[PDB]
Amino acid sequence: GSSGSSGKFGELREISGNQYVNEVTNAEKDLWVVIHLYRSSVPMCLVVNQHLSVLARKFPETKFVKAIVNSCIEHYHDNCLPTIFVYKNGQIEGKFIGIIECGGINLKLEELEWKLSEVGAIQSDLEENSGPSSG
């Protein structure tokens, strides 16, 4: 059966690197943490954040957070951002690397609202599949 997951959050917050883990990694059990790395240099991200702003109040269950790649990763050299990662129980529910992979400079508020859904972070309306991973 079901009980009723009460909302606790309702806004977009920012976390530090060392926190990314203790936060996302060490996140709750039945919680969906969706992080989105943005950079004042990359335009795509800027737009991705806009959706995350309204998507935060729409889905309080899913923990949304943003962090800068300023001395956070090594490998990351170029042609990587935007980058989005979905963590549920300390794993990678869904990752998105590349402007295109993240929808594109022409990404709509609905398009992205689905990506996170198809993964299991949220429940969008956009046409979805029976269940490749979620089930």
From Swiss-Prot:
Record protein name field:
Phosducin-like protein 2
Q: Give the originating organism.
A: Mus musculus (Mouse)
| UniProt key word Endoplasmic reticulum | yes
Pinpoint the Phosducin domain residues. Answer: 8-121
UniProt record, GO biological process: acrosome assembly; flagellated sperm motility; sperm axoneme assembly; sperm flagellum assembly; spermatid development
Q: What does this protein do?
A: Essential for male fertility, spermiogenesis and acrosome formation.
Subunit structure comment from the entry:
Interacts with the CCT chaperonin complex and actin.
By sequence similarity, the record places it as follows:
Belongs to the phosducin family.
| Tissue-level expression | Testis-specific (at protein level).
List UniProt keywords, sorted A-Z.
Differentiation, Endoplasmic reticulum, Spermatogenesis
Question: Region entry Thioredoxin fold: which residue ranges?
Answer: 9-129
Section of the entire sequence shown: 88 to 209 of 240
The record's gene field reads Pdcl2
Q: What happens when the gene is disrupted?
A: Male mice are infertile, show severe defects in spermatogenesis and exhibit lower testis weight, epididymis weight, sperm number and malformed and immotile sperm. Show dramatic abnormalities in acrosome formation and in proper sperm head and tail development.
Task: Report the superkingdom from the record.
Answer: Eukaryota
State the compartments where it is located.
Endoplasmic reticulum
- Which GO cellular component terms are attached? endoplasmic reticulum
The disulfides recorded in the entry are none
